Amino acid sequence: AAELPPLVPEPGDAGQPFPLTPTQQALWVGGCYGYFEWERPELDLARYRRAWERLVAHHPGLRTVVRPDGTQHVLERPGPVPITVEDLRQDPDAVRRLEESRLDPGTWPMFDLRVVLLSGRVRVQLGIDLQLMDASSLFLNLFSDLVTLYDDPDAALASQKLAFRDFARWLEEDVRGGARWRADWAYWQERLDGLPPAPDLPAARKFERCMVRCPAEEFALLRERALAHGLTETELLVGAFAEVLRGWSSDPAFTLNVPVFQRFDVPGIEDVIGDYTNPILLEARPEGRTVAERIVALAARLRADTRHASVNGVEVLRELARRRGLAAAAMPVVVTSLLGLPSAARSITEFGTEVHSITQTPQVSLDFQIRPEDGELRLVWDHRSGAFAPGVVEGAFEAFLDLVGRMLADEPGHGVWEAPFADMRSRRDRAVWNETNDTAEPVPAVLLQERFFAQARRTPDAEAVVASGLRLTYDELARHAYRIGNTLRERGVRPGDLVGVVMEKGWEQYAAVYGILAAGGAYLPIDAASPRGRVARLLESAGAGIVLTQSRLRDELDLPAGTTVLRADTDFETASTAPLTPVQGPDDPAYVIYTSEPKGVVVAHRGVANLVRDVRRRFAVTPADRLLALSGLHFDASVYDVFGPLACGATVVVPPPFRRAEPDVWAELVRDERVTFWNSVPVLLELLVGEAESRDDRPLATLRLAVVSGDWIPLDLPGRARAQAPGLRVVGSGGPTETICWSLFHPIDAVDPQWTSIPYGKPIANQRYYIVDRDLRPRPTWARGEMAVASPLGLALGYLNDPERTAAKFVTLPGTGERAYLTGDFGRLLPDGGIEILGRTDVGLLAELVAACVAELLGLDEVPTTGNFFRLGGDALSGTRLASRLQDLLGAPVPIRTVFGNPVLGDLASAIAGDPAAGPQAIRVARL
């Protein structure tokens, strides 16, 4: 505490210009009018006007106006105070005509005074410009004097002992730059690059209120609760407010704007209407296991941050804004507390019952107002309508009352004080989420192959696989599966073995898949166009000592010699067609599909069973359907193509092997084989839909259902496709390889122009889509977090030969003990239950000069031009020497002001290089 210089009241110039306070200068560039409307039965207008004429005269601030040149002075005689009266007594539905009635610092007055006469009651309206004074002068000086004076307009007022202009010059010239302000300015610059951004709350695609009053008895208890932790009521409420704000914020760490209204104990400043605001940038990083621990810790930082309040927060905002954006420096989440201030003589409530009031300040999104009134305690949140997603503020206010309520209910040391966290989802949040994720359905333990054989027996002569001028029937395909099945079984394939399938598009893939399952193994699809010896790299890695392939492709493949290779279309003609009795379990692996080391997603029959049975019921898949198997057997998307339609008697149309997209083919293949069911990543659908647009027929007309997923679904693609195919249902899906092909669905019926993406969807049978913060904890609606797909049967068993990565991505949600797969995808819950997918050079030499001098002065090896001087290690006594040694080295004056108002070393170089006083000299020395 470096003692401050004294205030020398200069009454000679009481009306000679002075500067706006920093917090006033910010309001002068950015309407902003706080408003108040009280009601009472009678009002002696003559007495009331006598009161405001005495008021205007007593208080210099009420006679202060701002010149056009950006400064201000105190008019010595401004005029009679304007009080517009509006007679509204002979008007039915007058309160209607009253609310229908809906100001500048350049023209006196900076307030607006109206009275509105109605039947048997009157409405006092007072409008004030936010620059005129701060919130503490409003309540502690104006309101308490308006009440004294409307009582007795002649009553005695404590003598004005100094001018607000005396206090405002004292601040800029005797305080700003002094001993103390320099120590405190180092405090802030040491910290500034570490300050997190303002709270990142969810936004939409002017000012509302949320309010509660705490009665005297609950106010008293709230205070005991705070003191029990050595906290002030404001410390507790700021700490609870940050806990609530983390329910919705993107990052747990934000900066809150916490203005204090300190007048520095100047004698006589307790009665001086002026502007005393001093924003304080509170760093709010969660520090502690428990709620109580974190609140206490943040309270300690606010306390220390306030020990250095001789620097006005608006100066820290200026520096912060140089470093990052003007946007990236905005602190629009404010906690304005009028607690801890002298009690005033009269409360405005003594004058009229409040009826309306709105402080709608500019460049503030949400302002948590803490103010005492009538020994109750007002908790007000003024928020800017439009600044946040619908409900986010309302739902956070609920969370906040519930958290304060719980502090009132629970004894310090127990309950909420001890909790690791408070669940912040609203009743509606958990209602809508549970409704949407009540997806449990029993999955009959009928193995994947044994379902298709049953279908082969039911309709044996029906088209199974149509593929390049060859049409396998269901019996024909079931027979060849049994050949591969019997063969593989008698060549060593016990349950839980892997059998590679290295092939190109064609019937031989289905044969091999169902044959490997019939034998009891799991099928390992690998790309027949893998580079180098990747196919050997995977096969060796998975442990697949048998490979099934095509005749026409065997020699084109670099397979290791020890492994046996069979060709599904020739090496099997002499094997039995006798059905195989299944020997693997429903939870044994059905396939192992690789995803870029490359990791092997292991998947059981059960969870595929779940997906097939879900799609059949959800989309009405009948045998009359024909599905085009476009995706490749080594992509998760092919899993529905393999087991879906073949399990219900529908027909698989396999397209000719392709090395690049060929929509011309596919559109004709949709036309000739009368295809109903399309499944592909979105861009491939765009190509198809693009090819059809440039054609005179309607080649996609047979398409009834087109499910796209795996990438962003263009916003016009669903409408485009419904043209080239009337009555097409376009369904958007998603879900990683580890949640079994498709795990959620969004039927795209109509695209909202307000949307930025298609909604990701809602989860299928036996899937549950949590959005969770970085502690695996479900978040409220609109809050952004990682998607966690919970399911006891609809998740991959694990990563092949890799308990560790499996452990880390397939986790136990701590809230429920559910096993969930951590998708690494990020999205957020929509209000209707859906999910939105979200993602995942002469100065230059003077700066090198400044930085080298700074590196020597602090004792450091190297120091970067971008570095902030005080963060690099500089305090206030060593920031003085920096100005000294630069003066020496450059032969130019570098004033101490120039070193501090430019903490960033690049900024100081630019300040010296463009110094009129001695820039050019300093430029020359720089050039060595």
Ligand X SMILES: Nc1ncnc2c1ncn2[C@@H]1O[C@H](COP(=O)(O)OP(=O)(O)NP(=O)(O)O)[C@@H](O)[C@H]1O
Stated as kind and residue range, the H or E segment containing 471 is strand 471-473
Q: Which does 664 bind (CB under 5 to 8 A by kind): ligand X, a second copy, none?
A: a second copy
The residues near 252 (Cβ < 8 Å, ≥ 6 apart) are: 246, 285, 286, 773, 774
CB 924 within 8 A of CB 912: no
Shortest spacing between CB 583 and ligand X, in angstroms: 30
555 binds a second copy (CB under 8 A): no
Q: Which does 394 bind (CB under 5 to 8 A by kind): ligand X, a second copy, none?
A: none
By CB under 8 A, name the one of 77, 427, 660, 774 that touches a second copy: 660
**For residue 232, which of 158, 340, 353 has the smallest C-alpha distance?**
340
Give 836's strand partners.
Answer: 828
Tell me phi and psi for residue 590, to 5 degrees: -100, -25
Shortest spacing between CB 850 and a second copy, in angstroms: 21
CB 842 within 8 A of CB 926: yes
Q: Count Cβ atoms below 10 Å from residue 841 Cβ, excluding itself.
A: 6
What's the Cα-to-Cα distance from 336 to each of 53, 96, 375, 726, rounded to whole Å?
30, 33, 18, 59
Q: Which does 823 bind (CB under 5 to 8 A by kind): a second copy, ligand X, none?
A: ligand X
CB 799 within 8 A of CB 805: yes
920 binds a second copy (CB under 8 A): yes
Residue showing the smallest CB distance to ligand X in the complex: 734
Measured from the CB atom, is 316 or 795 closer to ligand X? 795
Shortest spacing between CB 598 and a second copy, in angstroms: 20
Pairing mode of beta strands 366-373, 333-337? parallel
710 annotated ligand binder: yes
Give ∠ CA 51-54-59 in degrees, rounded to 5: 120
Measured from the CB atom, is 586 or 718 closer to ligand X? 718
Measured from the CB atom, is 230 or 914 closer to a second copy? 914
Shortest spacing between CB 204 and ligand X, in angstroms: 21
For the CA atoms of the chain, what is the radius of gyration?
37
Measured from the CB atom, is 574 or 596 closer to ligand X? 596
Site for a second copy in 690-719 (CB under 8 A): 694
Interface residue list for ligand X (CB under 6 A): 595-596, 636, 709-713, 732, 734, 736-737, 760, 823, 825, 837
Please give the full DSSP string across 109-138, using - where no structure is assigned. -SEEEEEEEETTEEEEEEEEETTT--HHHI
825 annotated ligand binder: yes
Measured from the CB atom, is 230 or 325 closer to a second copy? 325
Measured from the CB atom, is 736 or 903 closer to ligand X? 736
The residues near 93 (Cβ < 8 Å, ≥ 6 apart) are: none
CA–CA distance, 266 with 255 (Å, rounded to integer): 30
Q: Which does 215 bind (CB under 5 to 8 A by kind): a second copy, ligand X, none?
A: none
Only one of the segments 240-248, 384-392, 658-666, 851-859 lies at the binding site for a second copy (rule: CB under 8 A); that segment is 658-666
Classify 26 as helix, strand or coil.
helix
531 binds a second copy (CB under 8 A): yes
Stated as kind and residue range, the H or E segment containing 808 is helix 803-809
Burial class (CB in 10 A: 0-12, 13-18, 19+), 394: middle
102 binds a second copy (CB under 8 A): no
CA–CA distance, 282 with 304 (Å, rounded to integer): 10
CB 612 within 8 A of CB 476: no
Measured from the CB atom, is 283 or 664 closer to a second copy? 664
Shortest spacing between CB 532 and ligand X, in angstroms: 18
| Dihedral of alpha carbons 342, 344, 347, 348, sign | negative
Q: Which does 694 bind (CB under 5 to 8 A by kind): ligand X, a second copy, none?
A: a second copy
| Dihedral of alpha carbons 426, 432, 435, 440, sign | negative
CB 206 within 8 A of CB 33: no
927 binds a second copy (CB under 8 A): no
Only one of the segments 67-75, 290-298, 311-319, 377-385 lies at the binding site for a second copy (rule: CB under 8 A); that segment is 67-75
Burial class (CB in 10 A: 0-12, 13-18, 19+), 14: middle
Q: How many residues bind a second copy, per CB under 8 A?
A: 12
Q: Which does 920 bind (CB under 5 to 8 A by kind): ligand X, a second copy, none?
A: a second copy
659 binds a second copy (CB under 8 A): yes
106 binds a second copy (CB under 8 A): no
Shortest spacing between CB 721 and a second copy, in angstroms: 22
Shortest spacing between CB 521 and ligand X, in angstroms: 23
Shortest spacing between CB 596 and a second copy, in angstroms: 19
What's the Cα-to-Cα distance from 767 to each of 436, 563, 762, 794, rounded to whole Å?
10, 38, 9, 6
Tokens of 219: 């106010």
Shortest spacing between CB 659 and a second copy, in angstroms: 6
Q: Which does 713 bind (CB under 5 to 8 A by kind): a second copy, ligand X, none?
A: ligand X
**For residue 613, which of 740, 507, 522, 518 has the smallest C-alpha distance?**
740
Only one of the segments 33-41, 657-665, 710-718, 757-765 lies at the binding site for a second copy (rule: CB under 8 A); that segment is 657-665
Q: Which does 825 bind (CB under 5 to 8 A by kind): a second copy, ligand X, none?
A: ligand X
Angle between helices 233-245 and 291-306 (to 10 degrees): 120
Measured from the CB atom, is 234 or 767 closer to ligand X? 767
Shortest spacing between CB 664 and a second copy, in angstroms: 6
Shortest spacing between CB 867 and a second copy, in angstroms: 30
CA–CA distance, 322 with 332 (Å, rounded to integer): 17
Q: Which does 492 bind (CB under 5 to 8 A by kind): a second copy, ligand X, none?
A: none
101 annotated ligand binder: no
Only one of the segments 101-109, 426-434, 655-663, 874-882 lies at the binding site for a second copy (rule: CB under 8 A); that segment is 655-663
375 annotated ligand binder: no
Measured from the CB atom, is 352 or 735 closer to ligand X? 735
Shortest spacing between CB 506 and ligand X, in angstroms: 23
What's the Cα-to-Cα distance from 346 to each of 3, 144, 200, 219, 349, rounded to whole Å?
34, 5, 40, 20, 8
Measured from the CB atom, is 652 or 741 closer to ligand X? 741
Measured from the CB atom, is 88 or 715 closer to ligand X? 715
What's the Cα-to-Cα distance from 259 to each of 136, 336, 363, 380, 615, rounded to whole Å?
11, 6, 15, 16, 57
Shortest spacing between CB 284 and ligand X, in angstroms: 31
Q: Which does 737 bind (CB under 5 to 8 A by kind): ligand X, a second copy, none?
A: ligand X
469 binds a second copy (CB under 8 A): no
CA–CA distance, 670 with 688 (Å, rounded to integer): 10
Going by the annotation, the residues of the binding site for AMP are 710-711, 733, 737, 825
Going by the annotation, the residues of the binding site are 710-711, 733, 737, 825
Residues forming contacts to a second copy in the complex (CB under 8 A) are: 68-70, 531, 659-660, 662, 664, 694, 920-921, 924
